[PDB]
Amino acid sequence: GLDKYLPGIEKLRRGDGEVEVKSLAGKLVFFYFSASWCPPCRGFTPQLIEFYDKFHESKNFEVVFCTWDEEEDGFAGYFAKMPWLAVPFAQSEAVQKLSKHFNVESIPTLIGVDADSGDVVTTRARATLVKDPEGEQFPWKDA
C-alpha cells in the first residue's frame, strides 16, 4: 500500500541504521513534512514526539520524517533529535514528489495513510493533534 507514496524505496532510517518498509504492515503511517529551517516546526515537533511516545504502540502507528531540508550535513543532526523513521536524505526526490502528491504547500504538515491499502486517512493531523493531545478523536479522519 506504501508503494504508491515511496516508489521502489525498501528501507527507511531509524536512529543510526535502517528498517525495511515491510515492517510497517498493518500500521497507520504518518508522513511528517518538516525542516530544521522552518520556524513553526520548532514548536510542533516536540508535541508530536510526546504523542508518539504515548501512543505509537497502543494506537498502532508510525511516523516517517519527510525532510524539506536541502543541506545534507544537517540531516543527521535534525533527524537525530526524533524517535521515529525517516526517508533517507538521498531519496529526497521521492519526498518532493510525495509533497506534490499531497499538495503540501507549507510545513509542518502531517498526513496519515493506511500502510496496507495506501488509503489516505487524514491530511490535517498537524492541526488536529495540537487540539487533541490525548488522541480522543485519533486518527482525525478526513470527511
Helices vs. strands in the chain: H and E counts, helices first:
4, 7
Per-domain residue ranges of the chain: 1-143
Give me 98's grid cell: 510525495
d(CA 36, CA 26): 30
The highest-level CATH class for domain 1-143 is alpha beta
CB 126, CB 95: distance < 8 Å: no
Experimental technique for the deposited model: X-ray
